[PDB]
């Protein structure tokens, strides 16, 4: 996962989960990448799948 | 299985929009971004209960898809959770609507705008969408937006979340019924 083209004002809402470095399960890449941006680049990918 | 319930494809999970039919043929509607590149659909995470196979998919530009039921036993309720749906209608600004999805359950709000363009990126733009102040979260894609016993839209996407509040865009359901020649029941 590359979050270079983020932020994005909207995300489709399918569920394909990813696990963030904050232990939060992100529902999809779009939602995860927008969180990366919001964190000003501090949140990272821990692994694919739910946390 | 009914409107709002979880649906699983090879790739992930979406929500069933509405049960529809044509003649004696049963299908369900969901988002086109869910049908894109999905062939088979199941009712559970274990993929053991087959539902059917994708028959059509329109995304980007629009955001609707249709899956034809191949499972014969499964009850195919013409409802949204237990809410009966008897007809389809056009959304209007100020209309009170309700969304149901496999992750967040049921949430209400109102139609705040029509004909919105939403750009999901990479050339994935959709046009003609219904804007609302209803929230949605991953997994909720494709579930129904209804008002009373009226079918109104299919969940496509948006921002925010249910805790903080958000904005959700839906595909007008009339456009899919008419494209596929099916009707709600």
PDB file of C-alpha atoms in Angstrom:
ATOM      1  CA  UNK A   1       0.000   0.000   0.000  1.00  0.00           C
ATOM      2  CA  UNK A   2       1.027   3.581  -1.271  1.00  0.00           C
ATOM      3  CA  UNK A   3      -0.786   6.518   0.220  1.00  0.00           C
ATOM      4  CA  UNK A   4       0.788   9.043  -2.156  1.00  0.00           C
ATOM      5  CA  UNK A   5      -2.402  10.140  -3.851  1.00  0.00           C
ATOM      6  CA  UNK A   6      -4.070  10.898  -0.535  1.00  0.00           C
ATOM      7  CA  UNK A   7      -5.975  12.619   0.864  1.00  0.00           C
ATOM      8  CA  UNK A   8      -9.156  11.759  -0.926  1.00  0.00           C
ATOM      9  CA  UNK A   9     -12.436  13.388  -0.085  1.00  0.00           C
ATOM     10  CA  UNK A  10     -14.247  10.112  -0.284  1.00  0.00           C
ATOM     11  CA  UNK A  11     -13.850   6.456  -0.088  1.00  0.00           C
ATOM     12  CA  UNK A  12     -15.946   3.541  -1.410  1.00  0.00           C
ATOM     13  CA  UNK A  13     -17.005   1.366   1.534  1.00  0.00           C
ATOM     14  CA  UNK A  14     -16.125  -2.234   0.812  1.00  0.00           C
ATOM     15  CA  UNK A  15     -14.490  -4.168   3.590  1.00  0.00           C
ATOM     16  CA  UNK A  16     -10.906  -5.525   3.076  1.00  0.00           C
ATOM     17  CA  UNK A  17      -9.241  -4.892   6.334  1.00  0.00           C
ATOM     18  CA  UNK A  18      -5.701  -3.719   7.164  1.00  0.00           C
ATOM     19  CA  UNK A  19      -4.017  -3.435  10.579  1.00  0.00           C
ATOM     20  CA  UNK A  20      -2.539   0.004  11.535  1.00  0.00           C
ATOM     21  CA  UNK A  21       0.455   0.672  13.847  1.00  0.00           C
ATOM     22  CA  UNK A  22      -2.166   2.062  16.330  1.00  0.00           C
ATOM     23  CA  UNK A  23      -3.709  -1.391  16.624  1.00  0.00           C
ATOM     24  CA  UNK A  24      -6.750  -0.184  14.882  1.00  0.00           C
ATOM     25  CA  UNK A  25      -8.342  -2.287  12.149  1.00  0.00           C
ATOM     26  CA  UNK A  26      -8.834   0.011   9.041  1.00  0.00           C
ATOM     27  CA  UNK A  27     -11.705  -1.155   6.828  1.00  0.00           C
ATOM     28  CA  UNK A  28     -10.011  -0.542   3.502  1.00  0.00           C
ATOM     29  CA  UNK A  29      -7.002   1.037   1.971  1.00  0.00           C
ATOM     30  CA  UNK A  30      -8.762   4.350   1.264  1.00  0.00           C
ATOM     31  CA  UNK A  31      -9.815   4.705   4.818  1.00  0.00           C
ATOM     32  CA  UNK A  32      -6.357   3.672   6.057  1.00  0.00           C
ATOM     33  CA  UNK A  33      -4.520   6.038   3.733  1.00  0.00           C
ATOM     34  CA  UNK A  34      -6.707   9.006   4.750  1.00  0.00           C
ATOM     35  CA  UNK A  35      -5.815   8.256   8.376  1.00  0.00           C
ATOM     36  CA  UNK A  36      -2.121   8.208   7.470  1.00  0.00           C
ATOM     37  CA  UNK A  37      -2.559  11.721   6.077  1.00  0.00           C
ATOM     38  CA  UNK A  38      -4.506  12.889   9.032  1.00  0.00           C
ATOM     39  CA  UNK A  39      -1.764  11.677  11.297  1.00  0.00           C
ATOM     40  CA  UNK A  40       0.700  13.725   9.264  1.00  0.00           C
ATOM     41  CA  UNK A  41       2.541  10.575   8.259  1.00  0.00           C
ATOM     42  CA  UNK A  42       2.971   8.951  11.685  1.00  0.00           C
ATOM     43  CA  UNK A  43       0.584   5.982  11.320  1.00  0.00           C
ATOM     44  CA  UNK A  44       1.965   3.003   9.425  1.00  0.00           C
ATOM     45  CA  UNK A  45       0.930  -0.452   8.180  1.00  0.00           C
ATOM     46  CA  UNK A  46       1.459  -3.239  10.679  1.00  0.00           C
ATOM     47  CA  UNK A  47       0.085  -6.007   8.569  1.00  0.00           C
ATOM     48  CA  UNK A  48      -2.749  -6.910   6.156  1.00  0.00           C
ATOM     49  CA  UNK A  49      -6.001  -8.249   7.691  1.00  0.00           C
ATOM     50  CA  UNK A  50      -7.736  -7.285  10.906  1.00  0.00           C
ATOM     51  CA  UNK A  51      -5.547  -6.400  13.873  1.00  0.00           C
TER      52      UNK A  51
ATOM     53  CA  UNK B   1     -31.237 -12.918   3.430  1.00  0.00           C
ATOM     54  CA  UNK B   2     -32.477  -9.351   3.069  1.00  0.00           C
ATOM     55  CA  UNK B   3     -31.437  -5.753   2.359  1.00  0.00           C
ATOM     56  CA  UNK B   4     -28.488  -4.709   4.526  1.00  0.00           C
ATOM     57  CA  UNK B   5     -27.102  -8.224   5.107  1.00  0.00           C
ATOM     58  CA  UNK B   6     -23.444  -9.112   4.517  1.00  0.00           C
ATOM     59  CA  UNK B   7     -22.283 -10.495   1.199  1.00  0.00           C
ATOM     60  CA  UNK B   8     -18.883 -11.920   0.482  1.00  0.00           C
ATOM     61  CA  UNK B   9     -16.980 -12.129  -2.669  1.00  0.00           C
ATOM     62  CA  UNK B  10     -13.569 -13.388  -3.391  1.00  0.00           C
ATOM     63  CA  UNK B  11     -12.130 -10.112  -2.431  1.00  0.00           C
ATOM     64  CA  UNK B  12     -14.021  -8.773   0.610  1.00  0.00           C
ATOM     65  CA  UNK B  13     -17.363  -7.988   2.144  1.00  0.00           C
ATOM     66  CA  UNK B  14     -20.200  -5.735   1.016  1.00  0.00           C
ATOM     67  CA  UNK B  15     -23.832  -5.428   1.861  1.00  0.00           C
ATOM     68  CA  UNK B  16     -26.872  -6.697  -0.028  1.00  0.00           C
ATOM     69  CA  UNK B  17     -28.824  -3.733  -1.411  1.00  0.00           C
ATOM     70  CA  UNK B  18     -32.263  -4.991  -2.415  1.00  0.00           C
ATOM     71  CA  UNK B  19     -33.816  -8.269  -3.559  1.00  0.00           C
ATOM     72  CA  UNK B  20     -35.331  -7.740  -7.051  1.00  0.00           C
ATOM     73  CA  UNK B  21     -36.759  -9.907  -9.764  1.00  0.00           C
ATOM     74  CA  UNK B  22     -37.663 -10.269 -13.329  1.00  0.00           C
ATOM     75  CA  UNK B  23     -40.255 -12.805 -14.178  1.00  0.00           C
ATOM     76  CA  UNK B  24     -39.362 -15.822 -12.155  1.00  0.00           C
ATOM     77  CA  UNK B  25     -35.722 -14.799 -11.924  1.00  0.00           C
ATOM     78  CA  UNK B  26     -34.318 -13.632  -8.658  1.00  0.00           C
ATOM     79  CA  UNK B  27     -31.400 -11.264  -8.304  1.00  0.00           C
ATOM     80  CA  UNK B  28     -29.975  -8.839  -5.763  1.00  0.00           C
ATOM     81  CA  UNK B  29     -28.614  -5.381  -6.276  1.00  0.00           C
ATOM     82  CA  UNK B  30     -25.437  -4.113  -4.677  1.00  0.00           C
ATOM     83  CA  UNK B  31     -22.759  -1.505  -5.472  1.00  0.00           C
ATOM     84  CA  UNK B  32     -20.945  -1.795  -8.828  1.00  0.00           C
ATOM     85  CA  UNK B  33     -17.608  -1.275  -7.036  1.00  0.00           C
ATOM     86  CA  UNK B  34     -18.373  -4.539  -5.179  1.00  0.00           C
ATOM     87  CA  UNK B  35     -19.477  -6.426  -8.373  1.00  0.00           C
ATOM     88  CA  UNK B  36     -16.474  -5.249 -10.371  1.00  0.00           C
ATOM     89  CA  UNK B  37     -14.239  -8.187 -10.793  1.00  0.00           C
ATOM     90  CA  UNK B  38     -16.318 -10.514  -8.551  1.00  0.00           C
ATOM     91  CA  UNK B  39     -17.773 -13.570  -9.984  1.00  0.00           C
ATOM     92  CA  UNK B  40     -19.215 -15.571  -7.124  1.00  0.00           C
ATOM     93  CA  UNK B  41     -20.986 -14.328  -4.002  1.00  0.00           C
ATOM     94  CA  UNK B  42     -21.531 -16.145  -0.731  1.00  0.00           C
ATOM     95  CA  UNK B  43     -23.663 -15.510   2.364  1.00  0.00           C
ATOM     96  CA  UNK B  44     -20.893 -16.196   4.948  1.00  0.00           C
ATOM     97  CA  UNK B  45     -17.247 -15.517   5.678  1.00  0.00           C
ATOM     98  CA  UNK B  46     -16.453 -19.228   5.360  1.00  0.00           C
ATOM     99  CA  UNK B  47     -17.798 -19.114   1.816  1.00  0.00           C
ATOM    100  CA  UNK B  48     -19.897 -22.128   2.264  1.00  0.00           C
ATOM    101  CA  UNK B  49     -23.337 -20.796   1.410  1.00  0.00           C
ATOM    102  CA  UNK B  50     -23.434 -19.750  -2.132  1.00  0.00           C
ATOM    103  CA  UNK B  51     -25.707 -16.968  -3.160  1.00  0.00           C
ATOM    104  CA  UNK B  52     -25.160 -16.587  -6.830  1.00  0.00           C
ATOM    105  CA  UNK B  53     -23.133 -15.030  -9.594  1.00  0.00           C
ATOM    106  CA  UNK B  54     -22.523 -11.547 -10.889  1.00  0.00           C
ATOM    107  CA  UNK B  55     -24.683 -10.723 -13.961  1.00  0.00           C
ATOM    108  CA  UNK B  56     -23.874  -7.131 -14.412  1.00  0.00           C
ATOM    109  CA  UNK B  57     -21.679  -4.422 -13.048  1.00  0.00           C
ATOM    110  CA  UNK B  58     -21.573  -0.685 -13.659  1.00  0.00           C
ATOM    111  CA  UNK B  59     -18.681   1.289 -12.058  1.00  0.00           C
ATOM    112  CA  UNK B  60     -17.203   3.871 -12.224  1.00  0.00           C
ATOM    113  CA  UNK B  61     -19.586   6.514 -13.686  1.00  0.00           C
ATOM    114  CA  UNK B  62     -22.491   4.792 -12.098  1.00  0.00           C
ATOM    115  CA  UNK B  63     -22.224   2.572  -9.018  1.00  0.00           C
ATOM    116  CA  UNK B  64     -24.579  -0.478  -9.320  1.00  0.00           C
ATOM    117  CA  UNK B  65     -24.171  -4.215  -9.931  1.00  0.00           C
ATOM    118  CA  UNK B  66     -26.590  -7.177 -10.011  1.00  0.00           C
ATOM    119  CA  UNK B  67     -26.067 -10.794  -8.963  1.00  0.00           C
ATOM    120  CA  UNK B  68     -28.301 -13.576 -10.059  1.00  0.00           C
ATOM    121  CA  UNK B  69     -29.336 -16.057  -7.394  1.00  0.00           C
ATOM    122  CA  UNK B  70     -28.198 -19.658  -7.994  1.00  0.00           C
ATOM    123  CA  UNK B  71     -29.020 -20.727  -4.338  1.00  0.00           C
ATOM    124  CA  UNK B  72     -32.454 -22.284  -4.348  1.00  0.00           C
ATOM    125  CA  UNK B  73     -33.147 -22.836  -0.711  1.00  0.00           C
ATOM    126  CA  UNK B  74     -32.179 -19.456   0.809  1.00  0.00           C
ATOM    127  CA  UNK B  75     -35.165 -17.253   1.532  1.00  0.00           C
ATOM    128  CA  UNK B  76     -35.008 -14.128  -0.545  1.00  0.00           C
ATOM    129  CA  UNK B  77     -36.955 -11.485   1.497  1.00  0.00           C
ATOM    130  CA  UNK B  78     -38.235  -8.350  -0.135  1.00  0.00           C
ATOM    131  CA  UNK B  79     -37.338  -6.342   2.888  1.00  0.00           C
ATOM    132  CA  UNK B  80     -34.511  -4.469   4.509  1.00  0.00           C
ATOM    133  CA  UNK B  81     -33.909  -6.244   7.725  1.00  0.00           C
ATOM    134  CA  UNK B  82     -37.409  -6.667   8.756  1.00  0.00           C
ATOM    135  CA  UNK B  83     -38.764  -3.540   6.972  1.00  0.00           C
ATOM    136  CA  UNK B  84     -41.033  -4.227   4.044  1.00  0.00           C
ATOM    137  CA  UNK B  85     -40.174  -2.531   0.739  1.00  0.00           C
ATOM    138  CA  UNK B  86     -42.996  -2.108  -1.760  1.00  0.00           C
ATOM    139  CA  UNK B  87     -41.828   0.344  -4.240  1.00  0.00           C
ATOM    140  CA  UNK B  88     -39.004   2.481  -5.587  1.00  0.00           C
ATOM    141  CA  UNK B  89     -38.954   6.315  -5.610  1.00  0.00           C
ATOM    142  CA  UNK B  90     -36.845   9.219  -6.535  1.00  0.00           C
ATOM    143  CA  UNK B  91     -34.874  10.967  -3.802  1.00  0.00           C
ATOM    144  CA  UNK B  92     -35.683  14.596  -3.064  1.00  0.00           C
ATOM    145  CA  UNK B  93     -33.830  17.289  -1.139  1.00  0.00           C
ATOM    146  CA  UNK B  94     -35.025  17.173   2.525  1.00  0.00           C
ATOM    147  CA  UNK B  95     -36.274  13.598   2.322  1.00  0.00           C
ATOM    148  CA  UNK B  96     -35.835  11.554   5.503  1.00  0.00           C
ATOM    149  CA  UNK B  97     -33.986   8.377   4.674  1.00  0.00           C
ATOM    150  CA  UNK B  98     -32.509   5.283   6.415  1.00  0.00           C
ATOM    151  CA  UNK B  99     -29.491   3.254   5.523  1.00  0.00           C
ATOM    152  CA  UNK B 100     -28.760  -0.345   6.597  1.00  0.00           C
ATOM    153  CA  UNK B 101     -25.366  -2.057   6.180  1.00  0.00           C
ATOM    154  CA  UNK B 102     -23.482  -5.093   7.287  1.00  0.00           C
ATOM    155  CA  UNK B 103     -21.016  -3.237   9.501  1.00  0.00           C
ATOM    156  CA  UNK B 104     -22.952  -0.351  11.045  1.00  0.00           C
ATOM    157  CA  UNK B 105     -26.474  -1.590  11.071  1.00  0.00           C
ATOM    158  CA  UNK B 106     -29.204   1.014  10.649  1.00  0.00           C
ATOM    159  CA  UNK B 107     -28.694   4.767  10.579  1.00  0.00           C
ATOM    160  CA  UNK B 108     -30.957   7.727   9.559  1.00  0.00           C
ATOM    161  CA  UNK B 109     -30.653  11.143   8.161  1.00  0.00           C
ATOM    162  CA  UNK B 110     -31.783  13.171   5.270  1.00  0.00           C
ATOM    163  CA  UNK B 111     -31.057  13.881   1.567  1.00  0.00           C
ATOM    164  CA  UNK B 112     -28.993  17.107   1.467  1.00  0.00           C
ATOM    165  CA  UNK B 113     -28.261  17.267  -2.285  1.00  0.00           C
ATOM    166  CA  UNK B 114     -28.871  15.515  -5.720  1.00  0.00           C
ATOM    167  CA  UNK B 115     -26.706  14.932  -8.819  1.00  0.00           C
ATOM    168  CA  UNK B 116     -23.420  15.072  -6.926  1.00  0.00           C
ATOM    169  CA  UNK B 117     -20.127  14.069  -8.527  1.00  0.00           C
ATOM    170  CA  UNK B 118     -17.805  12.096  -6.309  1.00  0.00           C
ATOM    171  CA  UNK B 119     -14.278  11.483  -7.268  1.00  0.00           C
ATOM    172  CA  UNK B 120     -12.812   8.309  -5.690  1.00  0.00           C
ATOM    173  CA  UNK B 121      -9.544   8.896  -7.559  1.00  0.00           C
ATOM    174  CA  UNK B 122      -7.532   7.140 -10.255  1.00  0.00           C
ATOM    175  CA  UNK B 123     -10.225   7.980 -12.808  1.00  0.00           C
ATOM    176  CA  UNK B 124     -12.865   6.454 -10.569  1.00  0.00           C
ATOM    177  CA  UNK B 125     -15.460   9.170 -10.765  1.00  0.00           C
ATOM    178  CA  UNK B 126     -19.179   8.648 -10.292  1.00  0.00           C
ATOM    179  CA  UNK B 127     -21.886  11.077 -11.307  1.00  0.00           C
ATOM    180  CA  UNK B 128     -25.508  11.715 -10.419  1.00  0.00           C
ATOM    181  CA  UNK B 129     -25.263  10.755  -6.800  1.00  0.00           C
ATOM    182  CA  UNK B 130     -27.526  11.353  -3.871  1.00  0.00           C
ATOM    183  CA  UNK B 131     -25.757  13.222  -0.996  1.00  0.00           C
ATOM    184  CA  UNK B 132     -26.876  12.731   2.544  1.00  0.00           C
ATOM    185  CA  UNK B 133     -25.740  13.374   6.114  1.00  0.00           C
ATOM    186  CA  UNK B 134     -25.961   9.657   6.935  1.00  0.00           C
ATOM    187  CA  UNK B 135     -22.772   7.933   8.027  1.00  0.00           C
ATOM    188  CA  UNK B 136     -21.337   4.666   6.657  1.00  0.00           C
ATOM    189  CA  UNK B 137     -18.223   2.572   7.250  1.00  0.00           C
ATOM    190  CA  UNK B 138     -16.274  -0.138   5.386  1.00  0.00           C
ATOM    191  CA  UNK B 139     -18.480  -3.092   4.682  1.00  0.00           C
ATOM    192  CA  UNK B 140     -21.606  -0.978   4.328  1.00  0.00           C
ATOM    193  CA  UNK B 141     -21.053  -0.577   0.538  1.00  0.00           C
ATOM    194  CA  UNK B 142     -24.029  -1.510  -1.572  1.00  0.00           C
ATOM    195  CA  UNK B 143     -26.570  -1.571   1.277  1.00  0.00           C
ATOM    196  CA  UNK B 144     -29.996   0.015   0.834  1.00  0.00           C
ATOM    197  CA  UNK B 145     -31.082   3.548   1.417  1.00  0.00           C
ATOM    198  CA  UNK B 146     -34.831   3.562   1.970  1.00  0.00           C
ATOM    199  CA  UNK B 147     -37.597   5.789   3.228  1.00  0.00           C
ATOM    200  CA  UNK B 148     -40.521   4.121   4.796  1.00  0.00           C
ATOM    201  CA  UNK B 149     -41.412   1.262   2.411  1.00  0.00           C
ATOM    202  CA  UNK B 150     -39.695   3.059  -0.568  1.00  0.00           C
ATOM    203  CA  UNK B 151     -36.429   1.906  -2.039  1.00  0.00           C
ATOM    204  CA  UNK B 152     -34.264   4.904  -2.775  1.00  0.00           C
ATOM    205  CA  UNK B 153     -30.506   4.183  -3.270  1.00  0.00           C
ATOM    206  CA  UNK B 154     -27.473   1.948  -2.940  1.00  0.00           C
ATOM    207  CA  UNK B 155     -24.572   2.900  -0.683  1.00  0.00           C
ATOM    208  CA  UNK B 156     -21.510   3.962  -2.640  1.00  0.00           C
ATOM    209  CA  UNK B 157     -19.111   5.832  -0.495  1.00  0.00           C
ATOM    210  CA  UNK B 158     -18.263   8.963   1.392  1.00  0.00           C
ATOM    211  CA  UNK B 159     -16.300  10.267   4.442  1.00  0.00           C
ATOM    212  CA  UNK B 160     -16.528  10.604   8.100  1.00  0.00           C
ATOM    213  CA  UNK B 161     -17.724   7.741  10.342  1.00  0.00           C
ATOM    214  CA  UNK B 162     -20.706   6.886  12.549  1.00  0.00           C
ATOM    215  CA  UNK B 163     -19.005   8.093  15.769  1.00  0.00           C
ATOM    216  CA  UNK B 164     -18.131  11.501  14.560  1.00  0.00           C
ATOM    217  CA  UNK B 165     -20.876  11.778  11.884  1.00  0.00           C
ATOM    218  CA  UNK B 166     -20.185  11.822   8.153  1.00  0.00           C
ATOM    219  CA  UNK B 167     -21.507  12.241   4.577  1.00  0.00           C
ATOM    220  CA  UNK B 168     -22.632   9.340   2.375  1.00  0.00           C
ATOM    221  CA  UNK B 169     -23.406   9.312  -1.375  1.00  0.00           C
ATOM    222  CA  UNK B 170     -25.842   6.763  -2.819  1.00  0.00           C
ATOM    223  CA  UNK B 171     -26.628   5.534  -6.317  1.00  0.00           C
ATOM    224  CA  UNK B 172     -30.288   6.150  -7.234  1.00  0.00           C
ATOM    225  CA  UNK B 173     -31.896   2.754  -7.266  1.00  0.00           C
ATOM    226  CA  UNK B 174     -34.362   3.628 -10.056  1.00  0.00           C
ATOM    227  CA  UNK B 175     -31.488   3.779 -12.498  1.00  0.00           C
ATOM    228  CA  UNK B 176     -30.454   0.232 -11.767  1.00  0.00           C
ATOM    229  CA  UNK B 177     -33.963  -1.175 -11.882  1.00  0.00           C
ATOM    230  CA  UNK B 178     -34.453   0.336 -15.220  1.00  0.00           C
ATOM    231  CA  UNK B 179     -31.042  -0.711 -16.600  1.00  0.00           C
ATOM    232  CA  UNK B 180     -31.614  -4.367 -15.686  1.00  0.00           C
ATOM    233  CA  UNK B 181     -35.296  -4.497 -16.216  1.00  0.00           C
ATOM    234  CA  UNK B 182     -36.045  -5.707 -12.702  1.00  0.00           C
ATOM    235  CA  UNK B 183     -38.321  -4.546  -9.982  1.00  0.00           C
ATOM    236  CA  UNK B 184     -38.492  -4.632  -6.222  1.00  0.00           C
ATOM    237  CA  UNK B 185     -40.972  -6.887  -4.530  1.00  0.00           C
TER     238      UNK B 185
END
